[PDB]
């Protein structure tokens, strides 16, 4: 155990050992953007792949061409924090050497005429942060990965969508990456068809004739021949015995002297066996057998040259007579059946109205571009550019793989375009599906759906911008001359920036990141969406794709999804899931070999795991060898059954393999019903971080993994000792073995303090290490918002009781004690930003100033001399933070004085109060002000003071980090010189400037001293360079929006306590609203006088079946009992030996638990620190589907001297009497969700109204009224409340001359209205009149 893990060891109850640890949780986004942005020699990904897909490009003449050489990315102009402050995107400039060579077409090949190349700036691409996010326009975004269908060919049939016959219609679909589609399909008349881009149908031989295949070659490709042999007016036929399958023999087959079948006798397999053991080949057939067949060969006459019979036509008596007199004594008809070799292609050729390649191309043109006269070159060019052109069609190397795998081919590579053999194989395979061999494809398989991620989507949008810029530069180099043109002036840098900024700003998958807690960030980054560009559509999707497929096991979580209309469409990645090189999801598995479950870990896709047989995770082992039973439970082909121990092929790598992260943080998940487990996994992301975070007593073990992998903590990069801990800076002196020989060995960890998140919560990092403590590589130094000692901590441990309390927990409601409120347990900080921007009106500019017309001195009591509020001012609702007055002339006038400005005169003076006020009911201090003035004007005194504060702060920060690095470098200098020579006192009495020039002759330590002296020189050089860069960066102005003079950004900080109305929740879907905050003398209490903190209703348990709530309550009671015993020993100050014995006795309690915490290897101060962290309860890891049982829970409760049934006697706090039945009391982890009644409470009497409708606005932000909808109108109509309904429709709404009358009538004490016509009805009359329709009211 490490020296930071000995501080608080979570007692794991897990039984199965962790063979493979949980991987990096954010590997998907970071790996996708790294593949997009890195440089690759031949395996082209991203920018190099697009820059080779679009370059080089010549003219129409070939006089010149532009070549791509190499690309690089410059340093971003602003950092992450500076982009988040200034409100700009975090991007790096793209520079690429574009080589322009000039040919000489006047010469035969004048290749070298003029060669130009320079680093052309082609837009900026937004960089990804170290946590997986994109800072776009000052807001942090997350690009959600997409689940779309893979490119390739998919065979599927409708399930009888024509009940006139009940037939099923098999069909194919060749989906490319980019390019048109292709849909071969059947009809109820068994005639194949073709839909290109889902347009009107054409017969499916039009494509074959367009592929230069005549009717002869079509019939050879799609049929085999029953060859006939007519000699001297008796017909014989060359018979292979594998052609007579289950039909009544209308004719009798013969031999040389043998008779086999009789009249009216169906052919049997026994007779087929008879024929293949007698082995006759040539059988005389009667005349009537050929009458009914279809000839597969056109038969020209050799004498007259007249075509006596073509191919694909029905024969007859006169036709066979014509063949016999013409002399073709070997006629060839195709083999057909009625159950296994259908006459499909013959009927399609009969219904086909074209007979030539050119007429087929004309028909394809008339289907594609209707209402246009076709020609030869346009029809041929359109059909070639449909599928057989590299720049208008692409399967993109994953469609080729799925194409060859669906057609059972071998080579997984090839071209991206379609071909003759490809289309022929698709039609052949669809015919095979129709005949019976093979089955349709499962469209909800995860071998058919792939993961398209942020790097692939950014490569696609970069390619769109690239082909736009390519077209523009191609017409430029085709039109202009060649002597004065450069690549810099001929490449436009607008459309690539437009494409990538349109994507990264307002795509459907570029989402405003949820950062309530670290769990919300990690779940938003690990999200998979079925919607998006080229995916599904939300209202147009049904239960077929919103289901849990059996291939989702280990790849997609079944119990983390929203419960609204996005339920089967937004998904979450499983814990161990990865992607292929193609983008298909795969999950690890342990390989068994002769029963021995090895550590061979194989990542199998969904198509490979159906072939094998994979054992369950909950099957026991011995010595990591065989299975202890002989019939283990497995799953093959999607179904589950029992299998033998030598039959098994694979085994699951863990027990948390199926669930996602948030569904793995639920303890006792296997006792919760999946509905409430889904709701609890969703509600875990809505938890607000509190004032002091608290580790859960009943956890899982994924807490540390989430808290480190979320990137919200501050982990150590290298191991060493800690040199200085502030509340904003941790300095670590690195150990020598982890130190590079050229650096100073000093790590600086600046912490973020009170930064507003996306959901207006608090983000601040607090140091968890102390002064002088050692840390290792990967150690948590600073906690996050809702972390605690590197463990995820979303709520607080509340002593809970399950009983009804006077109806105060009636229907999911929660009764809360007063200690919860006094102890600030659910007190959350909500930082909130309000901006006041002084615009540029055309009547003059709006002035930010100290003087405000028509306010008292109770408004300017907190302002400064410049009009801005002071940093630290305890403002309340309605106070003025920054005063802004409009110029001479108002902007919108109130009707109380609008008539007084009309009849007396608008003064063209007396400016309007337009100040930034705190919203109503919102207290809080002011923690930061930021003024962004436009570049060019003199700013202000307060803005100048803020700028001097930033200047001296940046100088102090850079000089302090320079002094710290100088102290580290000088300590390394004195260490290496003490190791070299014996110079101790002569360097202490010498000043530190004379530490780099003295020494002795040249050795390894002298070279180290010289290179560290050069390190110090370049350190102070980069120090003064960065100081001057920061100085010019903070003195230069901010290029704001056009029309903006200056913006003042005020930052409030509200501290929110719980109150009745706040939604609280546990991890099992046990949500509800606080109904009352009870006094602690009124709360129920036990025999020791400890009152409970929260009273929950037990009626919410049985119909919802979330028993993990009750088991978490019991295990939390046992954990707090153990912590109470440790606290009693620490308050009695007993020993260290009895404490070591009791903590070891509590750690060794499980039945067959994996971890062995031995305290004999511990020191005494380590055991004392462990007990000081254990005195508030022993944290317990309960893995999902690997948890503690009732026997372990009851043994722990018997250790803690607690009742083993988990139910104690409670007394009423009011009457003093005892409750009759024993009540379940324990400790449950309760979260404060982000649905706060301060944010939901909103009332309005009269405010502002919409422009067109003259109805009130909508929202708490703009002070709007509640909608009285159609359903509420129906409710009032069903009551009969006609006057109430009429006053909802007119005087509380769009009756402009009636609502002012109603307001003055109410002020005059007269509760009577005078309603009139709704202005929205006048709007509707005007719109129907504008539609050319005379509607009018009729005066009787």
């Amino acid at each position: 155990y490490s020296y930071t893990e000995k501080k608080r060891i979570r007692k794991d109850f897990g039984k199965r050992p962790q063979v493979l640890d949980v991987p990096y949780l954010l590997s998907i986004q970071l790996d996708s953007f790294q593949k997009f942005i890195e440089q690759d020699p031949e395996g082209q990904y991203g920018l190099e792949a697009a820059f080779r897909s679009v370059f080089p490009i010549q003219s129409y003449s070939g006089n010149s061409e532009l070549q791509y050489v190499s690309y690089r990315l410059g340093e971003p102009v602003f950092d992450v924090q500076e982009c988040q402050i200034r409100g700009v995107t975090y991007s790096a400039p793209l520079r690429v050497k574009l080589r322009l060579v000039i040919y000489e077409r006047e010469a035969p090949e004048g290749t070298v005429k003029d060669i130009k190349e320079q680093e052309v700036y082609m837009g900026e691409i937004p960089l990804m942060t170290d946590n997986g996010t994109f800072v776009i326009n000052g807001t942090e975004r997350v690009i959600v990965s997409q689940l779309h269908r893979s490119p390739g060919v998919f065979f599927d049939s409708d399930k009888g969508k024509t009940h006139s016959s009940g037939k099923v219609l098999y069909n194919a679909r060749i989906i490319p990456y980019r390019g048109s589609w292709l849909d071969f399909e059947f009809d109820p008349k068994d005639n194949l068809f073709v839909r290109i881009d889902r347009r009107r149908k054409l017969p499916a031989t039009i494509i074959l004739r367009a592929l230069n295949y005549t009717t002869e070659q079509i019939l050879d490709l799609f049929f085999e021949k029953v060859i006939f042999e007519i000699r001297d007016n008796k017909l014989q036929m060359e018979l292979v015995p594998e052609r007579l399958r289950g039909e009544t023999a209308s004719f009798d087959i013969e031999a040389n002297g043998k008779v086999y079948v009789e009249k009216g006798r169906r052919i049997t397999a026994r007779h087929i066996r008879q024929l293949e053991k007698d082995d006759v080949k040539l059988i005389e057939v009667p005349v009537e057998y050929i009458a009914g067949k279809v000839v597969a060969k056109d038969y020209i006459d050799e004498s007259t040259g007249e075509l006596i019979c073509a191919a694909n036509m029905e024969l007859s008596l006169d036709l066979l007579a014509k063949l016999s007199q013409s002399g073709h004594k070997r006629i060839e008809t195709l083999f057909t059946n009625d159950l296994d070799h259908g006459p499909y292609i013959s009927e399609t050729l009969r219904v086909d109205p074209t007979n030539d390649r050119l007429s087929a191309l004309v028909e394809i043109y008339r289907m594609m571009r209707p209402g246009e006269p076709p020609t030869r070159e346009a029809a041929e060019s359109l059909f070639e550019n449909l599928f057989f052109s590299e720049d208008r069609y692409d399967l993109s190397a994953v469609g080729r793989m799925k194409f060859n795998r669906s057609l059972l081919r071998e080579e997984i590579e090839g071209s991206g375009i379609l071909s003759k053999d490809d289309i022929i194989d698709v039609m052949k395979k669809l015919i095979d599906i129709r005949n019976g061999k093979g089955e349709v494809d499962d469209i909800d398989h995860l071998g058919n759906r792939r993961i398209r991620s942020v790097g692939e989507m950014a490569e696609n949008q970069f390619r769109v911008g690239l082909v736009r810029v390519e077209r523009a530069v191609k017409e430029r180099l085709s039109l202009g001359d060649l002597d004065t043109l450069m690549p810099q002036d001929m490449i436009n840098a607008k459309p690539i920036s437009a494409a990538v900024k349109e994507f990264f700003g307002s795509s459907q998958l570029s989402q405003f990141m949820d950062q309530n807690n670290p769990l919300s960030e990690i779940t938003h980054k690990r999200r998979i969406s079925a919607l998006g560009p080229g995916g599904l559509t939300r209202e147009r999707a049904g239960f077929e794709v919103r289901d849990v497929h059996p291939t989702h096991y280990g790849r997609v979580c079944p119990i983390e999804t929203p419960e609204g209309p996005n339920i089967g469409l937004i998904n979450s990645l499983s814990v161990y899931a990865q992607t292929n090189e193609y983008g298909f999801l795969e999950t690890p598995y342990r390989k068994v070999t002769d029963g021995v479950v090895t550590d061979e870990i194989h990542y199998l896709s969904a198509i490979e795991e159906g072939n094998y047989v994979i054992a369950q995770a909950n099957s026991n082992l011995d010595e990591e060898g065989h299975f202890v039973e002989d019939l283990v439970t497995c799953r093959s082909k999607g179904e589950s059954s029992l299998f033998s121990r030598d039959q098994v092929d694979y085994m699951d790598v863990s027990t948390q393999q199926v669930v996602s992260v948030g569904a793995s943080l639920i303890p006792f998940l296997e006792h919760d019903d999946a509905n409430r487990a889904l709701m609890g996994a969703n509600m875990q992301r809505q938890a607000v971080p509190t004032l002091r975070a608290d580790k859960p007593l009943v956890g899982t073990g994924m807490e540390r993994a989430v808290a480190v992998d979320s990137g919200v903590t501050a982990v150590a990069k290298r191991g060493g000792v800690v040199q200085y801990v502030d509340a904003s800076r941790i300095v670590i002196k690195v150990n020598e073995d982890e130190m590079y020989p050229g650096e100073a060995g000093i790590d600086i960890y600046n912490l973020t303090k009170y930064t507003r998140s996306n959901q207006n919560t608090c983000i601040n990092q607090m140091p968890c290490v102390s002064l002088g403590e050692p840390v290792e590589r990967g150690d948590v130094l600073a906690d996050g918002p809702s972390t605690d000692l590197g463990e995820l901590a979303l709520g607080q441990n509340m002593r809970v009781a399950f009983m009804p309390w006077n109806g105060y927990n009636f229907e999911d409601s929660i009764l809360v004690s007063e200690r919860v409120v006094q102890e600030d347990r659910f007190t959350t900080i909500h930082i909130q930003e309000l901006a006041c921007v002084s615009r540029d009106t055309k009547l003059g500019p709006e002035e930010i100033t100290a003087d405000i017309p028509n306010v008292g001195e109770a408004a300017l009591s907190k302002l400064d001399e410049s009009g801005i509020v002071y940093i630290g001012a305890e403002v309340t609702g309605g106070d003025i933070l920054v005063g802004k007055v409009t110029p001479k002339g108002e902007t919108q006038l109130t009707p109380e004085e609008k008539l007084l400005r009309a009849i007396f005169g608008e003064k063209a003076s007396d400016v309007k109060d337009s100040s930034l006020r705190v919203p109503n009911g919102v207290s809080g201090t002011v923690i930061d002000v930021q003024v962004f003035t436009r570049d060019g004007v003199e700013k202000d005194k307060r803005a100048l003071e803020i700028e001097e504060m930033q200047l001296k702060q940046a100088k102090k920060d850079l000089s302090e980090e320079l002094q710290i690095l100088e102290a580290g470098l000088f300590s390394r200098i004195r260490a290496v010189l003490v190791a070299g020579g014996v110079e101790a006192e002569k360097l202490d009495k010498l000043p530190r400037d004379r530490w780099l020039e003295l020494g002795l002759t040249d050795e390894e330590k002298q070279n180290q001293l010289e290179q560290l002296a050069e390190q110090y020189d370049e350190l102070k050089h980069e120090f003064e360079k960065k100081l001057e860069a920061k100085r010019r960066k903070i003195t230069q102005g901010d290029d704001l929006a056009p029309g903006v003079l200056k913006i003042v950004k005020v930052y409030l900080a509200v501290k929110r306590r719980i109150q009745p109305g706040d939604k609280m929740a546990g991890r099992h879907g046990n949500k509800g609203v606080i109904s009352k905050i009870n006094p602690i003398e009124d709360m129920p209490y036990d025999e020791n006088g400890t009152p409970v903190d929260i009273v929950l209703n037990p009626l919410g348990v049985p119909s919802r079946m979330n028993i993990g709530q009750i088991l978490e309550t019991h295990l939390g009671m046992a954990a707090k009992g153990i912590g109470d015993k440790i606290n009693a020993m620490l308050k009695q100050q007993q020993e260290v030996a009895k404490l070591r014995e009791f903590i070891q006795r509590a750690y060794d309690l499980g039945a067959d638990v994996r971890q062995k915490v031995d305290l004999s290897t511990f020191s005494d101060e380590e055991v004392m620190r462990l007990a000081e962290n254990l005195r508030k309860g022993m944290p317990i890891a309960t893995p999902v589907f690997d948890g503690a049982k009732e026997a372990e829970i009851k043994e722990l409760l018997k250790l803690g001297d607690l009742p083993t049934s988990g139910q104690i006697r409670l007394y009423d706090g009011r009457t003093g009497e005892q409750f009759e039945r024993p009540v379940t009391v324990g400790y449950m982890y309760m979260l404060k969700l982000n649905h706060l009644v301060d944010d939901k409470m909103h009332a309005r009497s009269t405010g502002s109204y919409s422009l067109v409708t003259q109805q009130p606005l909508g929202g708490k932000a703009q002070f709007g009224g509640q909608r009285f909808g159609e359903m509420e109108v129906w409710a009032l109509e069903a009551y009969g409340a006609a006057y109430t309904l009429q006053e909802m429709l007119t005087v509380k709404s769009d009756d402009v001359n009636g609502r002012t009358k109603m307001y003055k009538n109410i002020v005059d004490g007269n509760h009577q209205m005078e309603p009139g016509m709704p202005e929205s009805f006048n709007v509707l009359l005007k719109e129907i009149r504008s539609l050319g329709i005379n509607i009018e009211l009729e005066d009787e």
Binding site: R366, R369, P370, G371, E372, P373
Partner: peptide, 23 residues
């Protein structure tokens, strides 16, 4: 061929195709 079209630029390009280019 006239008939099954509604795109007016397509109708313009169809009806302008009657005339021939000049030498």
């Amino acid at each position: 061929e006239i008939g099954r079209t509604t795109d007016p630029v397509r109708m313009y390009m169809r009806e302008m195709g009657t005339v021939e280019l000049l030498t």
